């Protein structure tokens, strides 16, 4: 829950995906952040010569062989996003990488393929590097049609529109640029476009791929750059600024919609200000002290947040000698508080370098993870404060070792600053959420079931190997529920059972399974039997209880005695009646049609045929219920009801033979079936699949195991029917395994 | 003035500028629009071959020798925007052109060098050309630092931040791209930034320049490019689209602020919508029926505008044979009304071609001019409707002749639609404001003065020759007023007096002025002169009337009046009462001080020292009214005042000799001062410029003529002080004369 006063300006971060340096996933990114490790990979001369960088530049001492690079520039799943191999070859690598990162952000949001009723805008940015321009334009142009298609597909300008076209997003799709605050500017436009209500979801956040991956950079004195290959923000050894690669996408909702839909929310963006320096600085690349102070004050006033209550600031933190004290003094002036050493500082550019179009979304994703985990990270590469940082009389301390959030700064509020080269300064105030009530004291909960699904079996193997650090990071219950309801399903399926001690047990396939057969559920004669089509196991399911309330409301005005009209009392008086057994079987079959929506046949022998017919809709419920009352006591003058047709996707059976619109008008075989009361099991051959549980069901999760084994077959099980009236909070499941085909870079000088 | 409902959603287009094909200014653009002029030019083989296009590419029959191009992409005034010459050479030729167009839009809004208290955002978007990438990266990378600076100045994506740096705009500055709708998406999020309160002004715009200017293009079957160099939207012989260069910037403001600040408003964007096609089309480069229909419906809903009240729709109108019936059908099914042919269809791409990424602001500027001029333009190259177009069962007709905006369509609402290749569809609903009243009642009353100013006399001559089409189009009085209050002043100045027949007479300069002399206002003796400090001519000023009312409100508490008060009949006893001559002089002097900010001396011949000290603050105003009443009766002893401190500046003199802090404290100087002198040049020689008006003054525009000659003689004039309580309306004055320097394109 949020637990602060809700103005209208509240945007929730409901799912984030990264491809930062050494940070392929969000958990690897958080691991690098809380471990405080630099993600720059210093290379070797053989690696530079392999990537096409010549010894006449390797011998140059102002060429630092270091780059915070991204693995997987050339890998792309073309067919998943609707591309041909020729189209994916002509695509920019930024287009391919942000295709995958944006899909992973929708997946982490829980909206991977349920973007139909939601308007989703794509607000992404992209840096431009001249290296891709040299490679792509230096190739032979050929014809004019190919050149027009190459200018459409292979430029970063149409990045957002390609992402929207592949992911079928029909909101405000903009491709922004403000050159270092590009992705907090994109997040600001996303927040404003959501608060206006143009879109209901918003993908925000940029990408930089410096085409030559595994290369170095030319440090130079007139530039600002890291002279040694490390970025040291707010540090006495601040060498300069290290330009990494990166890609980050956040998915954003209004907090009212995100709380109503049960979305996991990392943090909420309370307010966001954007200004520009204009001429109020030294030059075009200079920082502006007053512009940064004004944007922090405007965002704090925006968020109705006093900077007393801010416990972390993700600074822009470029690691330069002169820009860091301007940023610190602007933060000190905007925090006109006279409270000393309470807010932490941070810079993600210590870890992943400057990212230049994903720098703002790097800071936003890092700050949302900081508020989500309530853990102040360490600021990497920091030992001594910069000599002109007046750190002692300031609001801000710098964390050297990871710590949890201070108790006297609650609710956790934090600020994300990204200040552009170009002058565009963005500040965002973010508030953390109160953590979820885990009512377990690490007691024995249940074996949970994680339904992995991939379009091919090797990707399913990638998923199953992905599940092990995922269970190392999260809890099994929310990961299981999120893979149940928030992930789209595909052909190749696999369920993993996870116990209290973490052991990933693959559920076995179903036996006696034949392909291309209808799915049926048969209920025996309820006069002799006791199981009311497994209704003692659906008694928790908050849908059986819903249909029990429905039959209670229908019965009140129908039947006299109290013991038949109280809900949730039917467990003890189950064997004491037949009307109770029929009502239990009605609600059980309704839940067994909600689950397994492709369960097509309904079957029933003896007096369970009236539950089968009333659930299927072939007979109305009224005459079934009071008819079942006289089968409870009278068994004389049965009244055969009206011939209704069932629910048109569904179909009835008697013992496996479908009694469907060929005999249904007859009074003969209905009364012959009902008055017989035989219960005899159904025949061996019906060429269909029976929903028949194993007889070792004693623990209320073996039924969930069985419907998981059903899901591992062709059934598209709707798992939300199963769960009780406290539904599980969602959280983050697996990321998609992409069928990584390889497209090389056409490199030419 | 607006005549609709203020929901708080309205954004006023208060200033526009273009650089379109054959459209250097806004008026050339509107002339090309109303004449239906196709602004595409066709080249000969010698012109293209000498321009730098290969002979094989010329004699290819799949080459079309036509391009709607911008004149002057290599010209730029670098020193105006803070650029050195190499630094402006490293600017791409979209940065230079859009600095000029953006300054012209901000100047047309009247906020050139007035964006101090206003937070101004820049929301522009360029479309990158592969050919200037070939130029700029065909240059040798001699240094790494030069490559970094040439990557942050050479790339179009820093376009908005370069504009905001050069113009000192400190609001939300974004560079955007949504394709054929880049500049309407820019206008859209500019509108949302204004409506949210992020910025008070917003420069929204876009630009394409495909850098071989004057060069043809390649067409074939798989491209949408036109077969014959003609863009013919909604036409039977629609060949295909025709891509040209273009630039255009609108300046936007919230409508309540634009009405409060008295801005000229072209049109009012009532509501805007942006969606995307998504995957719901055939391909990525295809148009989408449902996206366009949904965005037109959403924009009409958010604007609270019924689609039967829309009298003109500026379409995308790309000129293709397939996309034109798709766009017409989406407009038809978004216009759910059953009325037939009440709305005109427009397409600026008939005129200027598909100016990519400036097409949205081309259509928006055209639509805002249509609503401003209340004129429905022809659709150019239109002869016959397309065979898939059902104009008969539709809300739309295609005008062939320039029609007036019909009655029973007030207030004039219009929609503008730009539909990107990329899927982003923007639709906007614009409402025209109202016509200007023109309350001269077709009579001759006043020559009016147009203060041109420029930093050099070549620029000032160019600005002077701007006035023949500007007076051919605009009203002279509002042209003069918005030159007076809404243009920045520079050093080289020239006033052009325009009489009521429109003939331009340059206003002759002051033939006797002294350059370093401080300016002073001498007022003579009050006992002998029936005339005050030109107060009979300054009576019509609003500032003078305000000061007279406040002064009389001070006066009547302890004046023991003879009831000659209330400051509206002071001309009645301006021959007799020394009291109201003195008070009238005080109010006038003070008006002269507020009208000319560089006024210093206040010399007086005797009893004019009381109004002089009343303005300069050395004696309090109540004290000089009381003492001057005592001088009116004069039977008692003379009074020595409290002798307060002087105001900074505004120093006192007696005959031109600035006397302060030597005998300003004691008594007898005041005695020999309040005894009269009756001498005009009492100083002899002191090298002081005076505000002695010409001796022949009849028409009351002669005093404004003298103030204009003072302005042309090197001092600032607060021109708004002069005018009455109905102030004139601002309008469009004059495009700035940029000192063009040629920056050639690099080879290959």
TrEMBL record, chain B:
Cross-referenced Gene3D superfamilies: 1.10.1240.100, 3.30.70.3290, 3.40.47.10, alpha/beta hydrolase (3.40.50.1820)
Keyword set, alphabetical order: Phosphopantetheine, Phosphoprotein, Transferase
Listed SUPFAM superfamilies: ACP-like (SSF47336), Thiolase-like (SSF53901)
Ranges annotated as spanning the membrane: none
GO terms (BP aspect): DIM/DIP cell wall layer assembly; fatty acid biosynthetic process
Domain called Ketosynthase family 3 (KS3): residue spans: 8-432
Keyword Phosphoprotein belongs to the record: yes
Domain of life per record: Bacteria
GO cellular component annotations of the record: cytoplasm; plasma membrane
GO MF annotations, alphabetized: fatty acid synthase activity; phosphopantetheine binding
PANTHER family in the record: FATTY ACID SYNTHASE (PTHR43775), SI:DKEY-61P9.11 (PTHR43775:SF37)
UniProt-recorded name of the protein: Colibactin polyketide synthase ClbC
Organism for this UniProt entry: Escherichia coli
Gene: clbC
């Amino acid at each position: 829950e949020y637990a602060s006063e809700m103005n209208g300006m509240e945007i929730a971060i409901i799912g984030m995906a990264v491809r930062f340096p050494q940070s392929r996933t969000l958990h690897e990114f958080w691991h690098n952040i809380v471990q405080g490790k630099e993600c720059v990979t210093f290379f070797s001369e053989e690696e530079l010569l392999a990537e096409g960088v010549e010894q006449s530049t390797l011998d140059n001492p102002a060429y630092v062989r270091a780059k915070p690079y991204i693995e997987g520039i050339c890998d792309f799943d073309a067919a998943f996003f609707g591309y041909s191999h020729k189209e994916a070859q002509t695509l920019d690598p930024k287009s391919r990488v942000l295709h995958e990162v944006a899909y992973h952000a929708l997946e982490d949001a829980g909206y991977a393929q349920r973007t139909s009723d939601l308007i989703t805008g794509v607000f992404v940015g992209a840096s431009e590097d001249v290296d891709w321009l040299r490679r792509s334009l230096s190739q032979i142009g050929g014809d004019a049609l190919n050149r027009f298609e190459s200018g459409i597909y292979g430029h970063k300008d149409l990045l957002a529109h390609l992402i929207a076209y592949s992911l079928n997003l029909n909101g405000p799709v903009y491709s922004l640029y403000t050159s270092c605050s590009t992705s907090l500017s994109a997040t600001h436009i996303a927040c404003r476009s959501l608060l206006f209500g143009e879109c209901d979801l918003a993908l925000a956040g940029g990408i930089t791929i410096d085409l030559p991956q595994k290369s170095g950079y030319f440090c130079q004195q007139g530039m600002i750059h890291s002279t040694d290959g490390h970025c040291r923000p707010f540090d006495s050894q601040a060498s300069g600024t290290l330009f990494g690669d990166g890609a980050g996408v956040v998915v954003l909702r209004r907090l009212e919609d995100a709380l109503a839909a049960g979305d996991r929310i990392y943090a909420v963006i309370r307010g966001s200000a954007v200004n520009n320096d204009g001429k109020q600085k030294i030059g075009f690349v200079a920082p502006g002290h007053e512009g940064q102070k004004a944007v922090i004050c405007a965002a704090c006033h925006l968020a109705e947040v006093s900077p007393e209550s801010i416990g972390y600031v993700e600074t822009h933190g470029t690691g330069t000698r002169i820009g860091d004290p301007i940023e610190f003094a602007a933060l000190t002036e905007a925090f006109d508080t006279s409270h000393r050493q309470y807010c932490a500082l941070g810079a993600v550019k210590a870890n992943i370098g400057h990212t230049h179009a994903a720098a703002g979304v790097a800071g936003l994703i890092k700050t949302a993870l900081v508020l989500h985990h309530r853990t102040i990270p360490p600021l990497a590469n920091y030992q001594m404060p910069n000599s002109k940082l007046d750190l002692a009389h300031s609001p801000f301390y710098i964390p050297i070792q990871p710590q949890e959030w201070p108790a006297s700064r609650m609710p956790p509020r934090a600020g994300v600053s990204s200040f552009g080269i170009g002058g565009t300064n963005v500040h965002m105030i973010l508030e953390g959420l109160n953590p979820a009530v885990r009512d377990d004291h690490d007691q024995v909960r249940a074996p949970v079931f994680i339904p992995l699904s991939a379009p091919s079996f090797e990707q399913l193997d990638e998923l199953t190997q992905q599940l092990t650090p995922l269970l190392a990071t999260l809890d099994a219950s929310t990961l299981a529920y999120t893979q149940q309801v928030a992930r789209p399903v595909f052909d190749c399926r696999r369920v993993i059972q996870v116990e209290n001690d973490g052991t990933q047990a693959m559920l076995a396939s179903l036996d006696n399974l034949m392909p291309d057969a209808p799915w049926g559920l048969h209920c025996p004669d309820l006069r002799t039997t006791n199981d009311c089509t497994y209704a003692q196991w659906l008694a928790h399911s908050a849908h059986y209880q819903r249909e029990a309330t429905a039959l209670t409301a229908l019965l009140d005005g129908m039947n006299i005695p109290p013991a038949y009209c109280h809900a949730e009392t039917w467990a003890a008086q189950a064997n004491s009646s037949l009307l109770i057994r029929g009502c239990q079987t009605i609600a059980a079959l309704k839940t067994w049609m909600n689950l397994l929506p492709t369960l097509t046949l309904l079957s029933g022998a003896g007096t369970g045929l009236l539950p089968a017919a009333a659930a299927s809709g072939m007979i109305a419920t009224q005459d079934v219920l009071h008819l079942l009352w006289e089968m409870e006591q009278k068994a004389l003058h049965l009244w055969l009801p009206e011939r209704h047709e069932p629910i048109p996707g569904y179909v009835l059976a008697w013992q496996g033979n479908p009694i469907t619109d060929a005999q249904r008008n007859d009074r003969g075989f209905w009364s012959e079936a009902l008055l017989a009361d035989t219960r005899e099991l159904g025949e061996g051959v019906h060429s269909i699949n029976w929903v028949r549980l194993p007889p070792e069901i004693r623990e209320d999760v073996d039924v969930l195991r069985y419907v998981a084994q059903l899901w591992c077959a062709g059934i598209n099980v709707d798992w939300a029917v199963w769960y009780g009236t406290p539904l599980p909070q969602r959280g983050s499941a697996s990321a998609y395994p992409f069928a990584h085909n390889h497209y090389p870079l056409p490199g030419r000088v």
